[PDB]
Design a protein around this ligand. Sequence first.
Ligand SMILES: Cc1cc2nc3c(=O)[nH]c(=O)nc-3n(C[C@H](O)[C@H](O)[C@H](O)COP(=O)(O)OP(=O)(O)OC[C@H]3O[C@@H](n4cnc5c(N)ncnc54)[C@H](O)[C@@H]3O)c2cc1C
Lengths: 133, 666, 10
Amino acid sequence: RKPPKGMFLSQEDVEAVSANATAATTVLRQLDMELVSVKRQIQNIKQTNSALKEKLDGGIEPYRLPEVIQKCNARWTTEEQLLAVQAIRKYGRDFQAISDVIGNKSVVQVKNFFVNYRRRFNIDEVLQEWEAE
Amino acid sequence: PSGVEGAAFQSRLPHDRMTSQEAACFPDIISGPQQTQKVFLFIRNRTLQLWLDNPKIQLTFEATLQQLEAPYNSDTVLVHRVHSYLERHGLINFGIYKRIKPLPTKKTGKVIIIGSGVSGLAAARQLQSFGMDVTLLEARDRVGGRVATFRKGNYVADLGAMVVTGLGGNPMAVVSKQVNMELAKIKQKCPLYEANGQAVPKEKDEMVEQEFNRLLEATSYLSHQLDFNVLNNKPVSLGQALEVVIQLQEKHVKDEQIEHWKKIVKTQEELKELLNKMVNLKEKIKELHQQYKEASEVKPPRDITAEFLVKSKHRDLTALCKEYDELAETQGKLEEKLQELEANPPSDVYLSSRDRQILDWHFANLEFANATPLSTLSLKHWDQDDDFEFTGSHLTVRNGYSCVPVALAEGLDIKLNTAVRQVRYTASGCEVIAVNTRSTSQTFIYKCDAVLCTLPLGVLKQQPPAVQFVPPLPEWKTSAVQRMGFGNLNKVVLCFDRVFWDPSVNLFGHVGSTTASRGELFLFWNLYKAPILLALVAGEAAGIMENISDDVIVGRCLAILKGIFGSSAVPQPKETVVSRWRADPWARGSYSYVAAGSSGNDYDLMAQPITPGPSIPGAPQPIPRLFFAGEHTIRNYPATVHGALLSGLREAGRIADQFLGAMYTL
Amino acid sequence: XXXXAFLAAX
Ligand SMILES: Cc1cc2nc3c(=O)[nH]c(=O)nc-3n(C[C@H](O)[C@H](O)[C@H](O)COP(=O)(O)OP(=O)(O)OC[C@H]3O[C@@H](n4cnc5c(N)ncnc54)[C@H](O)[C@@H]3O)c2cc1C
């Protein structure tokens, strides 16, 4: 009922090789062609990838800046308020970006800021202005 | 089994059932009550048992009944019916037994038996046992036919049959009890030696062997489970089936490799797109960094837009740096995966040259067992006797197998050197025209009631006919004779003066250089006490090697031997013998096989006796005059010796029944 | 072996 293990006996395959007197060596040669074409492709992409790998030499170490550690203060300096408004204008709703720009404010505090001063800082206008971009 | 079931087993019979034959002889029993059937069965088994427990003497009905116990010894006519049925079809009192009731004073009916091969001898001994006038016509100057033993001094070696394929249910068991045969076990271990003389490593050995068996099983699965049995309009042979299975293996291998390398490609391309990403990212990070520096240049105090600009670019830059570090992690992962894939590649090939060579040797072994190119065996049916295997280890006859036919020919009327040239069977009897093989003008005529024809299927196959049948065999029997297969197989006896091989090794191989030459001298046997080695030639090679002189052949032999053992170790053979069976005109081959397009059914056709047309027109359809026996006739055990012998016993029973009458069927 | 037992016809 079942072929031996390690033995692969499909209907489609048998009918496919039986058709001709040498459909055997035909299909087998086709497979050899597929095989070699594939390995060629491998060589190719291996070399382009080796080239790209050569470009990235140096990493980004020269361009990495140290990390500011400023604790979150609840009070909003007029400085930090202005930072904020600009940050909105550039980032829109990305509250995280905004928090990182200001540095000593958390995202919740950010949202609060949004709400409280939403009148006085016309934050509506600001957001739509960012949306234009 | 053991007990009376043991006997029923030993006699190739189901201890708990009535066979079709027994049904025919005893239709009152089977159609009747189960109880009685069981009685019958026990009577049969117990008689069997008796004979078997001592087959050196005749088992008379009186004796049988005397040793029977109640209630089984009540219905004495049943006991008698049974005893006779058994005696008749030689399930008992067959072979060579001291006759209790001395042979009948005056004979009855006349039977001419063509050929004193084993089937022949067996039947003849039975027919004589039953009191007919039997006479045998052997073309040769010796008995046995395809049981042939070379002897010179103490050198003794079978060019014919040689192996007893197991004793469980083998009549030959009985015969051996009757005849002094030095039987010896066959140590199954068989080393292989590539063309060079280097032994094949156990790794290789077992791997190949296993893949072989798996291939076979594969073909079988192809055959029965898939009904792969007719490619073109031609039937399919084992050969083609194996070839296909193999080609599918190679193809599958290629598929595996391709899938794998393609996985690797896909991954490589992922890596590519990744790298591109990372590079553009580093560019953006470079430019950002620059801009941040330029914004840091603007020294404080600064209005808030400026401060926002520095803070901004710093945020953005730390961001892109983050992103890039992630991408670098991902690159790490892709790279190690690619090392994994590139580290685990599927098998390079399906079969190497050494592999395919050893495989070829296993195939040569197969072609040897069946004595024919696997291209010829019937895919479906080539293994149909397989379900009747004897149990036990296969043995060899140390003192030459011929010791048996000879022993069978004691007391028989045999005419050696008599080639039968024509068989004439008529409504009123038969006449058989034969010539003296020595002086082929010296003619003989033999007239008789019936003619039992143990002519080798090859001889029957001959064109133009070695033996003429008048009137001609009918279309159905001829066609059966054309469809069947007769194979070829030869042996080379090498007689040296001292043992230079492994005396604990019974058989060892030699792997053929090519596919074509895989049969060519592929196997050796040390079975004899004497320094005698036996080389085999099978397959395609067996037919071609017959057109080559002895000396050349023994040449190639000693060559391979030297290659395996060393040039300063292989003496010249004091005596050398080479069989050519396909040449032998009293054989025309080795034994039969189930050619593609043939089946077992044709073995049955070969057995069916012939009934001649009526002399006077409008006369009753006669008695059957022409009977066939022999190895090619017995569906469940062809190409053997036990096979022959049984066919002989069978026909003798049939013939006797026909002319002396069966009194046990009432 | 296989088939086959040992040295049979098949
Ligand atoms: C090399 C070889 C090895 C074998 N090894 C084994 C083995 O190991 N184990 C096993 O079980 N079986 C084996 N066999 C098969 C077995 O030997 C035979 O099948 C068996 O002897 C069949 O006997 P037979 O009587 O039917 O044929 P035969 O023995 O050939 O009887 C036929 C007789 O008819 C004679 N005859 C032929 N033509 C004429 C004619 N025109 N006129 C008058 N007489 C004629 C022939 O001379 C012959 O004597 C082997 C066969 C061969 C060739």
